[PDB]
Amino acid sequence: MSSGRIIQIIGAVIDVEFERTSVPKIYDALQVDGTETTLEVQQQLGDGVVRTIAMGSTEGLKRGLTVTSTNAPISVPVGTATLGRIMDVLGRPIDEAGPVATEERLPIHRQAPSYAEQAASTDLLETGIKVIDLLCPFAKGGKVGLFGGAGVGKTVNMMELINNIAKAHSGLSVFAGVGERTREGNDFYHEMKDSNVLDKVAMVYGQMNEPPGNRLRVALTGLTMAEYFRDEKDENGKGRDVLLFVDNIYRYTLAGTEVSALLGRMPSAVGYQPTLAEEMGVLQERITSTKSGSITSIQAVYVPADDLTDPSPATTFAHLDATVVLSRDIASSGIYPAIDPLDSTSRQLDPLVVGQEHYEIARAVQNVLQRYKELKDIIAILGMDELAEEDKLVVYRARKIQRFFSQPFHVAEVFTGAPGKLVPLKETIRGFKGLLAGEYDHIPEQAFYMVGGIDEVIAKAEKL
Amino acid sequence: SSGRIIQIIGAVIDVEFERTSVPKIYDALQVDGTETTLEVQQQLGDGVVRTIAMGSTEGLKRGLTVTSTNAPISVPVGTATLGRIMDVLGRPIDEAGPVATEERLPIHRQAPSYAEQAASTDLLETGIKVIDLLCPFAKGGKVGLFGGAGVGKTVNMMELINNIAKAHSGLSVFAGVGERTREGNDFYHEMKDSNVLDKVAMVYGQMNEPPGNRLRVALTGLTMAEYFRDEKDENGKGRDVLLFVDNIYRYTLAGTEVSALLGRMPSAVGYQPTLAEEMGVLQERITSTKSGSITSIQAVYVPADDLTDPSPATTFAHLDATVVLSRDIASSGIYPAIDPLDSTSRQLDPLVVGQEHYEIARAVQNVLQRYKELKDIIAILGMDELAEEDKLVVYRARKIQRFFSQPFHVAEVFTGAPGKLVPLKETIRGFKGLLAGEYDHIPEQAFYMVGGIDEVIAKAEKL
Amino acid sequence: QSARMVAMKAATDNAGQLIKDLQLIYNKLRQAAITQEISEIVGGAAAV
Amino acid sequence: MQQLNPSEISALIKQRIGDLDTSATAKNEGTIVMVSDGIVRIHGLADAMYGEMIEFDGGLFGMALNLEQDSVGAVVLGNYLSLQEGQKARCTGRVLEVPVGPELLGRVVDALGNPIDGKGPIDAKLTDAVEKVAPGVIWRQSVDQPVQTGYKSVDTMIPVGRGQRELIIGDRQTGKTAMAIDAIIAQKNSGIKCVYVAIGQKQSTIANVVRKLEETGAMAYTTVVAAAAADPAAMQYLAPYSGCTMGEYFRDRGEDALIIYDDLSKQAVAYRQISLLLRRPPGREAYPGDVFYLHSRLLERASRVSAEYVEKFTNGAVTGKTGSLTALPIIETQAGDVSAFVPTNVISITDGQIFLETSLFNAGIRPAVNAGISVSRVGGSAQTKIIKKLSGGIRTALAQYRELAAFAQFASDLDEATRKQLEHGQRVTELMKQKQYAPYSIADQAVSVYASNEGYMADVEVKKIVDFDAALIAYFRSEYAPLMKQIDETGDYNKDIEAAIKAGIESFKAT
Amino acid sequence: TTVVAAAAADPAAMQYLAPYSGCTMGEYFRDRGEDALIIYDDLSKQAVAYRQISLLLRRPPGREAYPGDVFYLHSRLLERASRVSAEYVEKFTNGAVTGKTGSLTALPIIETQAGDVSAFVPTNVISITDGQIFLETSLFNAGIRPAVNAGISVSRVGGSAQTKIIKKLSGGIRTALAQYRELAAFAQFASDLDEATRKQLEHGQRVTELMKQKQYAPYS
Ligand SMILES: Nc1ncnc2c1ncn2[C@@H]1O[C@H](COP(=O)(O)OP(=O)(O)OP(=O)(O)O)[C@@H](O)[C@H]1O
Ligand SMILES: Nc1ncnc2c1ncn2[C@@H]1O[C@H](COP(=O)(O)OP(=O)(O)O)[C@@H](O)[C@H]1O
Ligand SMILES: [Mg+2]
Ligand SMILES: [Mg+2]
């Protein structure tokens, strides 16, 4: 008989007593009897005494009030119908469009993936964005560092990513709002809806209007969603490979600090939870590929105080695999996306990964873009025609490069007309190589702007 | 009769005794089972007492009987201990069987009274240019070596031993406190290759043993020295005392290891607030008295190269000669890496080293000081933007720096070149000539890792 | 005129370098100060 | 008054009311009381030993930490979520054992001798207690024997002897792991032992390294132990000790070995977490003061020993052999945090250190070796006579060169001496580079450095010089094969040998 | 002269209380219509020792492990040092002495870490004292012996405690020092400045060198 009664209440932490013959284990779920609030076992205090946290407001509550358990960690609905649906951390609909259709429920927690299941290969995700596709290729089951301020089309880039992964690789998309502000969340919803992509993504937000535990566990919630979809096998096995979008993991670490402090435990070097690395990892290891299916992660990253040596970003980089940065100037230069093709770093940038020729090509592009960047100041100050004509050739060629790296987007089609263009490698590679050969030094920069492959570029150039 | 364990944490243990007999504050305690000894720490009262471990902490179970000796730690003392290597308890480890002395002396005692304080005012050369100029020694004074990690402190210790102890006649004692065993074995073998091994007596406590052993180890050696300083020479006052200590900071670290476990709250930093007291009781047991003279050499590790951590600062006020190494200068390749600036000696007045020596030292010091202030501007502007005198200053100071590099007869293992024992007269002559500018046409490299000014000229011509 | 121009360019570059240096040290010092103060606070709270 | 003892439990109180003594079979079985985060306070085990493994009715193990007047505190070995108080635990009487011996080779295993590779249940003849102290001073032996890196820069400036300790240190992804694996491959005929420990790494990464060693055949004289970030903190905190214990086996048989400590920093982080979770008052940067002791206890165990010492460890089983054990630690810093607390402590203990510069790696110099702060305290005793003679001041000269170049960045009035010094320093700089998985033979470095000291290289192009070297070696191995054969068989420098080298050099310069 | 000794290895409370006794003797002279002086050597050690003592008492700690009352300690210590009215002592002596008045000056020593001034104990003692007297390391290293830094050391008392002649003279000296300190940043560029500024700098240099003195060599 699992009914236990409240014994002590402070703030958000909650204490209950039970019988010393039937004691719930840690991370078990407690539903308050007569109300819709839920309690989460944290540490066994002996004497049938348990200290737990609550999930939401704590008002009016009074001691000695009966509470039952579930003898199990938190389980939420999972299934195909979960797309186009916004649920809480508890997987409970907030779209207010009926309950969840599925009856399939899975506990939130599970151990780390087996060493045996780590796929003995490492290959690259295909994307059609023509920039990461050369400079920072993604691994299969990698972590992509993303940086930059708002208003540069973060949502737009996510749109295009989702479109491509669902289209070619039949990927499924899950998004988790950690510490979300409601207004932008609703805007993102409306964008999911107008751009006909909502039907393919599963959405859960944790607002900064909630106690920390909500915000901490939305992460594992979305994670488990992704796990269920991947492990959901396809025909002939081989479940999908899926992408995961998570906002401001730094907020996650902050909420972890929150709950650790509320437990009354001492801080860390800066003052984070001393256990920081534990939860960071527990998040990480369930992000990988397997012999069946794969999972890849996109994570919004914010660096408070610009400290590359702060513990939180330091722990982040311990798992980062590729870095992508967004520019303000580049977007102001009418180039979209505004990915800086000079700071983005990929662990996968090796001739042993993208191949020999691809690697060398990318290195050469990097050299050209650098070379032109230090050229810029002299061009500004000491004029232009006071330099080596080869350097001027470099200038023109780099300008063509920059003009070219932007492209139309299939998501941009509904935005401003101009249907986007999907482009794989082995054409980007060839076109860029030919550009490096200087065989296109007879053409204005315009043919490279807002265009697909080099064949399209030449078509425009002839037509221009 | 006997007591037994109540709790075990790390190196701190508790014993329950009958109110009829409870041990005194410092007493040797024999674990009645395995081979382990305990030192009383606090009179926890009600038959409860707190102690520290002297061996491993294993096999120990709560309730095992233990007896007192009613006596603190007393180790063998005398000439029979010399040429030997004993443990923190005086037990031999050199496999030379038991020591043939039955004299025993406790490790604790009171500081020498003020009335018995003696003053050493007699110079002591080292054959080391930068030191013998900037840091003179008094035979029997307190000299310490400050330095961070790997800055060459140990090497300096061996060099000083080579250039002093061998030329010295009489006994000598050195002990390491939490050291790398390799160097210890090497050093012992080294004296074995020599024939002064008899003259020295040897002690180890290393960074491989329980912290209790790490704690009260130097006490043994300094007590050896107290004995010897107080041993009257046959028909005269006792021969001088050669004392050498490694990593005194490790003492404070050992105290730190348990300071919390004593129930003490943390000090301003994780250090123990008692710090100064156990520092001083150590330090004041090192002075030279009317009877006997003790020459104290101390290498001091610097945490994080923070000279102003509490431990270096607090230690600092107990030495007459200050010697600190700078990590960057070593990174600049110079050996020894002794800062010309911070390192001082109380024997630096014209009334001791001679007016001329004091003048030259003051002058070169001021030149280096001036350059150091000047050093920032050239980082922003071209050196040419400076006055001509300033350029002279820059070149003079840089060549001085080059000249400080002195090859040593121990450093040949690193490189192969032989050392230099430059007489002070040559040093002073060379520096007067340099600050006379007699060499303002000489490439700087002619001064690097050389001997005397004559060698500088020879190098320059070889250039 | 040429020499002055070049010297000004070099000055700008050295300024940038020093800026990097100072910024790094500032980050370190801020971290250290935060550590010290939080240690103080937790010790004082533990006092009761 | 003060807080309750976490041992005053109405059940226990009522039991003592019934009768005080004979508690829990003279305390052979313990019952759990307090549960949080892999940390368990337990009542009723006095027979239990400090530092003992603790069995569980859950089938798991526990680590003895605090023996106290009324209760015991312990840390959980493995996942603890399957626990709750009121369960049974006992004291094994064995203390912290782990399998060890030849059978361990070519296996991927947990920090408790548990096969995590799933390639069959691993067996053993012997286990051993994990925690021990390093032998006495009269039992150590001066390091004198070569260790190969296949690296020009390393082997040249930083000799490595068997039984020494050298820190590799740098910033994130400076190729530290690469250096280690190179060292491992650099041992395939030395007949020496080698084992690898990783801390807080991604399982994917671990598998990458595993497969690399597989295809290289490295999985024939080696073993690996994994401390992933998912692993419980205590597991990671203990794993290096297990690695040390496994390694010492062969030094206990008068044989040498190399163990690769990866991410000791993360290990320190985990142990700090443990200590704080034990309410241990912290010091600077929240690390408890024992961190120095923490590492030293590990580090000092690996060394070269006196043959009679092992002959004592043997029962006459060995007729006297030089026992030794070398280790390789890895420390990660935050943007040039060279004066950082933990690394400073490390250096205080190591007998050698190697630091890699980030920008030079980004500048493509690989390995990007800061010759300045990179030393091996033993010195030339760790290399063949050839390397001893040819080297001797090159590292110092390079450091002085870089100092001058740094000072000359705003100087343009050089004499000829300094100008040639800077030229030669640049030269020697570009000399010291190679690609991943490029093991050099000793003769390679020998002829190269000889030519360098012989000005055959100041005359050539700062770029072409790398070709000047590659083609040079190709030429030489094409022609003088028995000569290098002999010298790499012995490492001996003779004057006639030097003349033959000069002949090879001139013949190459003629081509 | 008289000195009381609290050696480094002496019991903590001995250091903790010695300055009080020294003050007792100083007052004793002051209360005889006389005036005298005492020297306090590095109150820092005293403060640290009192910290230790308090901590052993499990006293509630504060910043840098210091309980607040350390202020109270130093305050009530230095407060005792001052000059009294002749009437006060005269009645104290019960008319045994009438003419003279009592006085007492004291000098405490504070040791700085990296020359920092924001340190707690320095902050307090500065807030208490009549004024600062400061010395800079590099000046001693610049040969300036003593190495007083006039830029920050002052006395609220002012010339009131100086005789007619010295107060009459010190003015232009202070002015010249202020001028030289003013032009410090350009001191390394005496090639393009004003000639009169060069003269001011030269005067400052000369007076700077004038402020050198040996040890044990006081001046009438
Ligand atoms: N000598 C070399 N030549 C060419 N490439 C190299 C060399 N050394 C390292 N690299 C490259 O550097 C890349 C990253 O280095 P590595 O992964 O070994 O760093 P790490 O020690 O694992 O650091 P972290 O622990 O942060 O991952 C590798 O992909 C490798 O290709
Ligand atoms: N006189 C010298 N000449 C050249 N190199 C030296 C000299 N003295 C020390 N070194 C270098 O400095 C290091 C000294 O370290 P060591 O003194 O053993 O430890 P610590 O200084 O930490 O006590 C050695 O690695 C050696 O290469
Ligand atoms: Mg040292
Ligand atoms: Mg690595």
JSON list of C-alpha atoms in Angstrom, two decimals, chain A residues 91-154:
[
{"chain": "A", "resi": 91, "resn": "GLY", "atom": "CA", "xyz": [4.44, 14.40, -22.13]},
{"chain": "A", "resi": 92, "resn": "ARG", "atom": "CA", "xyz": [1.03, 15.93, -21.55]},
{"chain": "A", "resi": 93, "resn": "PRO", "atom": "CA", "xyz": [-0.50, 17.95, -24.38]},
{"chain": "A", "resi": 94, "resn": "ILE", "atom": "CA", "xyz": [-0.55, 21.72, -24.03]},
{"chain": "A", "resi": 95, "resn": "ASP", "atom": "CA", "xyz": [-1.68, 22.41, -27.59]},
{"chain": "A", "resi": 96, "resn": "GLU", "atom": "CA", "xyz": [-5.17, 21.72, -26.20]},
{"chain": "A", "resi": 97, "resn": "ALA", "atom": "CA", "xyz": [-6.14, 19.56, -29.17]},
{"chain": "A", "resi": 98, "resn": "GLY", "atom": "CA", "xyz": [-7.17, 16.39, -27.39]},
{"chain": "A", "resi": 99, "resn": "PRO", "atom": "CA", "xyz": [-5.09, 13.86, -25.48]},
{"chain": "A", "resi": 100, "resn": "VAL", "atom": "CA", "xyz": [-2.16, 11.92, -26.87]},
{"chain": "A", "resi": 101, "resn": "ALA", "atom": "CA", "xyz": [-3.23, 9.22, -29.30]},
{"chain": "A", "resi": 102, "resn": "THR", "atom": "CA", "xyz": [-0.66, 6.57, -28.38]},
{"chain": "A", "resi": 103, "resn": "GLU", "atom": "CA", "xyz": [-0.82, 4.21, -25.44]},
{"chain": "A", "resi": 104, "resn": "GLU", "atom": "CA", "xyz": [2.89, 3.42, -25.70]},
{"chain": "A", "resi": 105, "resn": "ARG", "atom": "CA", "xyz": [4.78, 4.58, -22.60]},
{"chain": "A", "resi": 106, "resn": "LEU", "atom": "CA", "xyz": [8.48, 4.33, -21.79]},
{"chain": "A", "resi": 107, "resn": "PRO", "atom": "CA", "xyz": [10.41, 5.33, -18.66]},
{"chain": "A", "resi": 108, "resn": "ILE", "atom": "CA", "xyz": [12.52, 8.43, -19.04]},
{"chain": "A", "resi": 109, "resn": "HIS", "atom": "CA", "xyz": [15.76, 7.00, -17.67]},
{"chain": "A", "resi": 110, "resn": "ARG", "atom": "CA", "xyz": [17.90, 4.17, -18.94]},
{"chain": "A", "resi": 111, "resn": "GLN", "atom": "CA", "xyz": [21.56, 3.29, -18.68]},
{"chain": "A", "resi": 112, "resn": "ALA", "atom": "CA", "xyz": [24.18, 4.53, -21.08]},
{"chain": "A", "resi": 113, "resn": "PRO", "atom": "CA", "xyz": [24.41, 2.87, -24.50]},
{"chain": "A", "resi": 114, "resn": "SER", "atom": "CA", "xyz": [26.51, -0.27, -24.55]},
{"chain": "A", "resi": 115, "resn": "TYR", "atom": "CA", "xyz": [30.11, -0.11, -25.68]},
{"chain": "A", "resi": 116, "resn": "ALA", "atom": "CA", "xyz": [29.17, -2.96, -28.00]},
{"chain": "A", "resi": 117, "resn": "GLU", "atom": "CA", "xyz": [26.60, -0.82, -29.82]},
{"chain": "A", "resi": 118, "resn": "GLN", "atom": "CA", "xyz": [28.99, 1.98, -30.75]},
{"chain": "A", "resi": 119, "resn": "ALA", "atom": "CA", "xyz": [29.09, 1.62, -34.53]},
{"chain": "A", "resi": 120, "resn": "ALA", "atom": "CA", "xyz": [32.54, 0.52, -35.76]},
{"chain": "A", "resi": 121, "resn": "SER", "atom": "CA", "xyz": [32.36, 3.10, -38.55]},
{"chain": "A", "resi": 122, "resn": "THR", "atom": "CA", "xyz": [32.16, 6.88, -38.73]},
{"chain": "A", "resi": 123, "resn": "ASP", "atom": "CA", "xyz": [30.70, 8.57, -41.79]},
{"chain": "A", "resi": 124, "resn": "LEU", "atom": "CA", "xyz": [29.12, 11.88, -42.74]},
{"chain": "A", "resi": 125, "resn": "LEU", "atom": "CA", "xyz": [25.59, 13.19, -42.92]},
{"chain": "A", "resi": 126, "resn": "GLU", "atom": "CA", "xyz": [24.62, 14.56, -46.30]},
{"chain": "A", "resi": 127, "resn": "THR", "atom": "CA", "xyz": [23.15, 18.06, -46.26]},
{"chain": "A", "resi": 128, "resn": "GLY", "atom": "CA", "xyz": [22.40, 20.34, -49.18]},
{"chain": "A", "resi": 129, "resn": "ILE", "atom": "CA", "xyz": [23.58, 23.63, -47.70]},
{"chain": "A", "resi": 130, "resn": "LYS", "atom": "CA", "xyz": [26.88, 23.69, -49.58]},
{"chain": "A", "resi": 131, "resn": "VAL", "atom": "CA", "xyz": [28.82, 25.29, -46.70]},
{"chain": "A", "resi": 132, "resn": "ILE", "atom": "CA", "xyz": [29.07, 22.76, -43.88]},
{"chain": "A", "resi": 133, "resn": "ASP", "atom": "CA", "xyz": [29.06, 20.23, -46.71]},
{"chain": "A", "resi": 134, "resn": "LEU", "atom": "CA", "xyz": [32.64, 21.29, -47.43]},
{"chain": "A", "resi": 135, "resn": "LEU", "atom": "CA", "xyz": [34.11, 23.13, -44.48]},
{"chain": "A", "resi": 136, "resn": "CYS", "atom": "CA", "xyz": [32.51, 21.43, -41.46]},
{"chain": "A", "resi": 137, "resn": "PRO", "atom": "CA", "xyz": [31.01, 18.11, -42.49]},
{"chain": "A", "resi": 138, "resn": "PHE", "atom": "CA", "xyz": [28.94, 16.47, -39.79]},
{"chain": "A", "resi": 139, "resn": "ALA", "atom": "CA", "xyz": [29.73, 12.97, -38.63]},
{"chain": "A", "resi": 140, "resn": "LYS", "atom": "CA", "xyz": [26.97, 10.39, -38.29]},
{"chain": "A", "resi": 141, "resn": "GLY", "atom": "CA", "xyz": [25.99, 10.70, -34.65]},
{"chain": "A", "resi": 142, "resn": "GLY", "atom": "CA", "xyz": [27.95, 13.85, -33.91]},
{"chain": "A", "resi": 143, "resn": "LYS", "atom": "CA", "xyz": [27.56, 17.00, -31.84]},
{"chain": "A", "resi": 144, "resn": "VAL", "atom": "CA", "xyz": [27.50, 20.37, -33.61]},
{"chain": "A", "resi": 145, "resn": "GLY", "atom": "CA", "xyz": [28.50, 23.50, -31.73]},
{"chain": "A", "resi": 146, "resn": "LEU", "atom": "CA", "xyz": [26.37, 26.47, -32.74]},
{"chain": "A", "resi": 147, "resn": "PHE", "atom": "CA", "xyz": [26.97, 30.08, -31.73]},
{"chain": "A", "resi": 148, "resn": "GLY", "atom": "CA", "xyz": [25.81, 33.58, -32.54]},
{"chain": "A", "resi": 149, "resn": "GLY", "atom": "CA", "xyz": [23.09, 36.01, -31.53]},
{"chain": "A", "resi": 150, "resn": "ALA", "atom": "CA", "xyz": [19.42, 36.00, -32.40]},
{"chain": "A", "resi": 151, "resn": "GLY", "atom": "CA", "xyz": [17.86, 37.62, -35.43]},
{"chain": "A", "resi": 152, "resn": "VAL", "atom": "CA", "xyz": [20.31, 35.92, -37.80]},
{"chain": "A", "resi": 153, "resn": "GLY", "atom": "CA", "xyz": [17.88, 33.20, -38.86]},
{"chain": "A", "resi": 154, "resn": "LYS", "atom": "CA", "xyz": [18.61, 30.47, -36.31]}
]
